[PDB]
Specification:
This is part of a larger assembly, with chains A, B, C, D, E and F. Chain A is mostly beta strands. Chain A is built from no helices and eight strands. Chain B is built from four helices and four strands; from the N terminus they run H-E-E-E-H-H-E-H. Classes of the chains: A mainly beta, B alpha+beta, C mainly beta, D alpha+beta, E alpha+beta, F alpha+beta. The structure holds magnesium ion (22 copies) and zinc ion. Chain D binds three RNA strands through strand 1, helix 2, strand 2, strand 3 and strand 4. Chain C: This is Large ribosomal subunit protein bL25.
Chain lengths: 77, 119, 177, 178, 134, 57
RNA sequence: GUUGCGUGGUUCACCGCGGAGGUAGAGCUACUGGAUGGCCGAUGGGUUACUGACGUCAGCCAAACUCCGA
RNA sequence: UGCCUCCUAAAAUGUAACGGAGGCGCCCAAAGGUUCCCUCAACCUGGACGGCAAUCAGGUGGCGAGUGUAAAUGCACAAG
RNA sequence: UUACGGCGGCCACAGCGGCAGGGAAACGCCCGGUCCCAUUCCGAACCCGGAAGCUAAGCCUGCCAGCGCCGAUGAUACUGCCCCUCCGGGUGGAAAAGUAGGACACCGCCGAACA
């Protein structure tokens, strides 16, 4: 019998995606969206992060929006 | 056209610096609009889009100032440096408008840094 | 000429469209010149016969709870397997507007020499007044050599009828073999 | 004040309104720029375009040219990307009118066996391109201080809308057409 | 019939559920064979039905195959245990759902056209029927 | 960049053997360029076998 | 899982409100590929009955296609 | 046989097989930092050598180019 | 109130294209390179000093559905739960496509002419 000598491997799942949803109250420093690239962009009171990690700069409430085609994540203090 | 190229290219430069410079209630944004004859300036407060102070070279006080176009840029730099202080403002952020910092625009900016504004 | 007795639908949905079909009726809508659309039943076989004759354009006279209304057939939804009308789109007309209609092109002639006759489009979309709407418009072949191909341009269409499809729709192509 | 420019606004600027019926004087065509380049493709090998193409176009035109690098590698040309293959100068203003006058007066008849330039070499807007074949067209370079002979092609970019409008401009300046 | 390239040499099976939502009327010709049940119709079955229509009319007329076998099926080597990799592709298959028109025919005679299509239905692993342009 | 990288460029007198003379700004050292032919004295700027047998006889 | 000590409705269900999706479906001149019949016809072939690019007109398909989208 | 990316994976996350495809065990003193400026590939027309395609000039072109390096997610506001 | 100039919201119902008309102040092309500054070459651009010329272009205004864009109602596909041997049915949701149509944007602050 032959073998699947060319296949059989995979990396670990990275647990990416939205971590805090809309209208949800957060603290300062809480990670909102974990992603590769900017699937979401920062807004008011939101910073990007080193590997595009979209955290909170200010305690408040998460709200999603649109700003000229791009979809953004913002915080309303 | 050369004017059609010049309008698009200077507002592409003005959108380029707009990504990093906003202007708020406590710290308004000093926007300059420079032309071949006159220069215009205003403080825009980009949270509701409301100008709180403005100045230009077309008004009769700057119109009768002797000298070159840089001497009339200092005079309009002095006027918004007191219409802002009359409005309760002492710090701003400077907006090039898409032009190069230097020449007539830096002379407007140096007249504003001497008469009270602290950018 | 086409007396068609309709009745206004009571409840609308997936469940009520199925129950109307078990009574032999056809659900439809009536939307027209800037009005709110009407939701209404069709008698089924009496609507199936009136398009079995008179073509599919077939200006209808409706009886909407005692009220009369002239309607063209905009669209039909045929089930692919049962081959039965599921839904009808009816739009109102008033005695002549420049409404758009596709109409079948019937083909006449004799491929005398070594010639096979193929037809690509079956209907051209002409625009005509909203009560004439000719039954079909013909096309003819004079014994065409494998070659010269007849088009939507140089079709035989009467007065008031205008070709607004394209004046390059190849309706009949003739080839060798 | 270059003498081809004062001759341009004297009668050429006014004769074009009567041939082409313009409504406004901001529609009269004018040559905006003259671009000369070498195109030394035999500089991917041996890398000597220094004295060759740079030091003569400075003498022909009056200012130092820009060196143009290659944008994509082509194997058959032995061409690698980022390698100097072209040398280009761009002439505006008074050095443009002093080039076009010096070109048509004492240089363009020095072509060997010269019977005129083609009037069909307009691209569609009214920009004219023709190609020289040697450097000895110009007196400003000498045959004894140069390396191997090479040619150049010269664009004349005008404010003209169409071709015969641009053809009537360059005819009035003094291009000889056959 | 065989594709000249596929992007993916080994695929999952096409899914035999649903009613055909595209290709369900006669477009090109006059008479058409319409499918009534799900099956995988291989390329060997289509060529047996193409030569069966063409040998019953023999000249005159035009046959359309608006079905292409571009989905590959795989097969293990013969006397093998289960599971040491997926097998190599063996068949080429079109996914045929109920409603899908498979063959279309133009012919001047109604009897010979309807009888040339009946010979094709006996070469296919489906119940089917003959439909016309309404 | 418009300083002492460009070659020298000043006024230059051009004369032809025809008698043409005009004044430009060029790179010839001294400004004494002399041509043998110009736009005024060049040609193109101002300009059968049956008859062969007839000429013989 | 059970049991001791804590804590107390924080759990769970339904109703309403605020949110992120790319599956089923569908679509493709919206991309990447596959592909049927025409029309046009690059070039190849043998001077032009064969190849028939690119286009365009109709009808289609896809776990690793997606302008869409429960 | 460890790590990384995709599909399987059933629209959060996660998910198996000797299931379907690929990469990694580096490279860069700039290919890092900041400041400012620019817009691509393809197609068409014209042009000494010069050709399908080098360099040039004018059109058209909203991203089909590009990204040190696999793929996904991104990036024309540019991260090119 | 403007066939005004800016700064934003907004990111095609707002774009692209076509055809007309506009110049008070302003916006522009424009005329020059002495001085700050500038071009991998070039006062083209960037920067500076000017006001002879002109609305030709940008910009603005009006009109065009042409190419794009937005797009129901109804119906269908699919589907949660339930009944049911399959087939299908009951209840609650509900597309994409196409059609009727819409649409040559709308709103805010400052300046100028007018109020
Ligand atoms: Mg993964
Ligand atoms: Mg890092
Ligand atoms: Mg389909
Ligand atoms: Mg709830
Ligand atoms: Mg909800
Ligand atoms: Mg949802
Ligand atoms: Mg996916
Ligand atoms: Mg599917
Ligand atoms: Mg394709
Ligand atoms: Mg084809
Ligand atoms: Mg999918
Ligand atoms: Mg799930
Ligand atoms: Mg998941
Ligand atoms: Mg490996
Ligand atoms: Mg660096
Ligand atoms: Mg890396
Ligand atoms: Mg960069
Ligand atoms: Mg005025
Ligand atoms: Mg200048
Ligand atoms: Mg005008
Ligand atoms: Mg609906
Ligand atoms: Mg829709
Ligand atoms: Zn002479």
């Amino acid at each position: 019998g032959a073998s699947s000598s060319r296949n059989g491997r995979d990396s670990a799942a990275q647990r990416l995606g939205v971590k805090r949803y809309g209208g949800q109250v957060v603290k300062a420093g809480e990670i909102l969206v974990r992603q590769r690239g900017t699937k979401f962009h920062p807004g008011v009171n939101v910073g990007r992060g080193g590997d595009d990690t979209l955290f909170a700069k200010t305690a408040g409430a998460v709200e999603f929006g649109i700003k000229r085609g791009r979809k953004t994540v913002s915080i309303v203090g | 056209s050369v004017s059609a190229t010049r309008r698009i290219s200077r507002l592409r430069r003005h959108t380029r610096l707009r990504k990093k410079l906003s202007g708020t209630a406590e710290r308004p944004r000093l926007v300059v609009h420079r032309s071949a004859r006159h220069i215009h300036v205003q403080l825009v407060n980009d949270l509701n889009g409301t100008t709180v102070a403005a100045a230009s070279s077309i008004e009769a006080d700057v119109r009768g100032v002797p000298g070159d176009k840089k001497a009339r840029s200092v005079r309009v730099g002095q006027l918004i440096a007191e219409r802002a202080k009359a409005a309760g403002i002492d710090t701003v952020v400077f907006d090039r408008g898409g032009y190069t910092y230097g020449g007539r625009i830096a002379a407007l900016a140096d007249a504003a840094r001497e008469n009270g504004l602290s950018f | 000429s086409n007396q068609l007795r309709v009745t206004v639908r009571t409840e609308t949905g997936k469940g009520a469209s199925r129950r109307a079909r078990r009574a032999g009726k056809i659900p439809a809508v009536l939307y027209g010149h800037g009005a709110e659309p009407q939701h209404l039943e069709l008698p089924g076989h009496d609507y199936a016969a009136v398009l079995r004759h008179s073509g599919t354009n077939a200006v209808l006279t409706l009886d909407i709870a005692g009220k009369e209304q002239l309607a063209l057939t905009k669209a039909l939804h045929i089930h692919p397997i049962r081959r039965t009308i599921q839904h009808a789109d009816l739009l109102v007309v008033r005695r002549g507007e420049k409404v758009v209609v596709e109409v079948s092109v019937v083909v006449e002639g004799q491929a005398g020499p070594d010639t096979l006759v193929t037809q690509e489009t079956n209907s051209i979309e002409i625009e005509a007044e909203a009560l004439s709407i000719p039954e079909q418009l013909t096309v003819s072949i004079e014994g065409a050599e494998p070659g010269t191909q007849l088009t939507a341009g140089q079709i035989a269409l009467p007065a008031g009828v205008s070709l607004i499809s394209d004046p390059d729709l190849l309706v009949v192509n003739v080839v060798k073999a | 004040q270059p003498r081809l420019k004062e001759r341009y606004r004297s009668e050429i600027r006014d004769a074009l309104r009567k041939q082409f019926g313009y409504g406004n004087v901001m529609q009269i065509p004018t040559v905006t720029k003259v671009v000369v380049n070498m195109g030394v493709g035999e500089a991917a090998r041996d890398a000597k375009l220094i004295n060759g193409a740079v030091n003569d176009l400075a003498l022909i035109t009056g200012q130092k040219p820009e060196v143009r690098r290659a944008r994509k590698s082509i194997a058959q040309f032995k061409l690698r990307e980022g390698m100097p293959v072209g040398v280009r100068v761009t002439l505006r203003g008074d050095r443009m009118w002093e080039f076009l006058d010096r070109l048509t007066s004492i240089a363009l008849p020095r072509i060997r066996d010269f019977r005129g330039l083609s009037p069909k070499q307009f691209d569609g807007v009214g920009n004219y391109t023709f190609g020289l074949a040697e450097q000895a067209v110009f007196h400003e370079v000498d045959v004894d201080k140069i390396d191997r002979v090479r040619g150049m092609d010269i664009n004349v970019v005008t404010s003209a809308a169409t071709d015969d409008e641009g053809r009537a401009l360059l005819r009035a300046l003094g291009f000889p057409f056959k | 019939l065989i594709p000249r390239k596929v992007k993916h040499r080994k695929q999952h099976h096409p899914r035999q559920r649903g009613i055909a939502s595209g290709g369900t009327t006669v477009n090109f010709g006059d008479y058409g064979i319409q499918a009534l049940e799900h099956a995988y119709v291989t390329n060997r079955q289509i060529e047996s039905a193409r030569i069966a229509i063409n040998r019953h009319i023999k000249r005159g007329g035009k046959v359309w195959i608006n079905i292409f076998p571009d989905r590959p099926l795989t097969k293990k080597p013969a006397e093998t245990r289960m599971g040491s990799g997926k097998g190599s592709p063996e068949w080429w298959v079109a996914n045929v759902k109920p409603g899908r028109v498979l063959f279309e025919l133009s012919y001047p005679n109604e009897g010979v056209a309807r009888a040339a299509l009946t010979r094709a239905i006996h070469k296919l692993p489906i119940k089917a029927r003959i439909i016309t342009r309404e | 960049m418009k300083s002492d990288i460009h070659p020298a460029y000043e006024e230059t007198t051009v004369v032809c053997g025809c008698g043409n003379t005009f004044q430009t700004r060029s790179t010839k050292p001294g400004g004494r360029i002399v041509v043998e032919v110009c736009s005024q004295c060049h040609p193109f700027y101002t300009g059968g076998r049956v008859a062969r047998f007839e000429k013989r006889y």
